[PDB]
Design a protein around this ligand. Structure first.
Ligand SMILES: COc1cc2nccc(Oc3ccc(NC(=O)/N=c4/cc(C)o[nH]4)c(Cl)c3)c2cc1OC
Ligand SMILES: COc1cc2nccc(Oc3ccc(NC(=O)/N=c4/cc(C)o[nH]4)c(Cl)c3)c2cc1OC
Lengths: 272, 274
């Protein structure tokens, strides 16, 4: 009885409604501006030959379209036109966290990590609450807004192993919510040190290390608070049942923060 | 990379987690259930799903409901597939359906009461339309009262069915989107709340189809009893030209749906309780 129409428009030119006004990253992500509202979007134009592949993407689009949280990036539009799939999502002016680290040539401060951790955790907890796993949480997928806030995105064969949880590597089997928590732990170290743990190792050797080795730690413990190192121990726990949920982590003192000023200042340096 | 798990539990007995108290409607069977661990109240529907092709058809409706998050739309609390039954549990709305209240009390709603229901229902519908969902069966039987005096929109469930709420363009099979047909049905629902019965209720159902296709839009039986704001709101809903008929976004700007209080409905429930 209740019917939901498709989230991708058809037989309509995207550029009738959005002007491409530049390039943001090098596949290619574009910057677009709505011709009627002036709203800014990031746009991705993915080549969709296989109609079986379009259905595979449209699944990810449906999940994104149904999400409604301030710390998860919103889908503004989607089109199928002349065999391309355009995805337009809310523009996050501060850019990705990894790009900020590469531009400034510095890791984040603990104060900055703290804000990102708390907001990312709010996003993730909402996903988990709605039976969604992110699966690719890393610093490259955390975006800064302009007001100093985080939005979680997904920029896009086994792939890169650095953020993978031991139970996924060891194929230990109902749900994989905890794997996102592990990845959050790796992401925090990545923001503290620019690169994730084991970055210097061959990808095959990293799989071995994740399966066989003690959880990764910060390279220089004395530079960081006990709250932070403790928070890491809860995320980077190899026993899946001992590893904390996002709901438990929200009660941790490390994410008892109030101001987003560290991030406002970080993106004021980046803008200069 | 993002993955969504299924909204329906499997290999698990629903009655491990929910106790059936009693029955709510035998108008299918809707049950009243209470969570064994939280004490939360639900309405439960236990639908027989022999056909695996039918289960997929229901699971689609469950996904839409699970993704909705609005105060004026009924929330899915749980869903199970167990021993060939599909259990659907949704938030319990203690006041029941609007049509049943009118039939029990033997009176229509007042304009003040219609105004609250219209505004809240319009917030729900506008949210649906915004998210590319059409309700398709908007009638007074699908508007539920809460204890507090609010509305939640529900859906109780080659045959044609009943015609009274059908839009002219659907009857005349004129055709991309049918958002406007919900707006027409909203108009019919308002008259239904003003008069208990929908327009043309006294006519043969075939003659109702004829009337919808061929006649001037339906009107209130006694226009002098109702404000100009209300009748004007109706004219925007019950416009046979689909392009002239207002969207829910346009209707939200209408003065009829500026309301600051649900007190008319709280008082309606206080009459019913007496
Ligand atoms: C200021 O600098 C940037 C700002 C950005 N603001 C918002 C979005 C940006 O890039 C994207 C990141 C992810 C997605 N997509 C996404 O999250 N989901 C999907 C899912 C599928 C199948 O298709 N895309 C998109 Cl569209 C764009 C940005 C890239 C920038 O330059 C670095
Ligand atoms: C006090 O009296 C009642 C109170 C009620 N409170 C809440 C819900 C009630 O009935 C339902 C109404 C709708 C649905 N379902 C619904 O809205 N959607 C779906 C979606 C799918 C696939 O399957 N049903 C259900 Cl379960 C139950 C009620 C029925 C009553 O007695 C009249």
């Amino acid at each position: 009885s209740m019917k939901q129409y498709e989230h991708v428009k058809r037989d309509l030119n995207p550029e009738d409604f959005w002007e491409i006004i530049g390039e943001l990253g090098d596949g290619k992500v574009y910057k677009a501006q709505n011709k009627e509202t002036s709203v800014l979007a990031a746009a991705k134009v993915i080549d969709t030959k296989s109609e079986e592949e379009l259905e595979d993407y449209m699944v990810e689009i449906d999940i994104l379209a149904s999400c409604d949280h301030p710390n998860i990036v919103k889908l503004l539009d989607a089109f199928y036109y002349e065999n391309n799939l355009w995805i337009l999502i809310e523009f996050c002016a501060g850019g990705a966290v990894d790009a900020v680290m590469l531009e400034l040539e510095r890791p984040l401060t603990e104060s900055q990590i703290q804000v990102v951790c708390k907001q990312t955790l709010d996003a993730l907890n909402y996903l988990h609450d709605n039976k969604i796993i992110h699966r690719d949480l890393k610093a490259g997928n955390i975006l800064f807004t302009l007001d100093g806030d985080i939005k979680l995105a997904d920029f896009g064969f086994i792939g890169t192993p650095y953020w993978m949880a031991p139970e996924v590597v060891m194929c230990e089997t109902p749900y994989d919510y905890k794997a996102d928590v592990w990845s959050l732990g790796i992401t925090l170290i990545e923001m503290a040190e620019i690169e994730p743990p084991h970055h210097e190792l061959n990808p095959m050797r990293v799989l071995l290390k994740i399966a066989k080795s003690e959880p990764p730690t910060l390279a220089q413990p004395s530079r960081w608070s006990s709250n932070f190192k403790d928070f890491l121990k809860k995320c980077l726990e190899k026993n899946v049942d001992a590893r904390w949920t996002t709901s438990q982590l929200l009660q941790h003192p490390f994410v008892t923060v109030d101001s987003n000023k560290p991030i406002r200042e970080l993106i004021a340096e980046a803008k200069a």
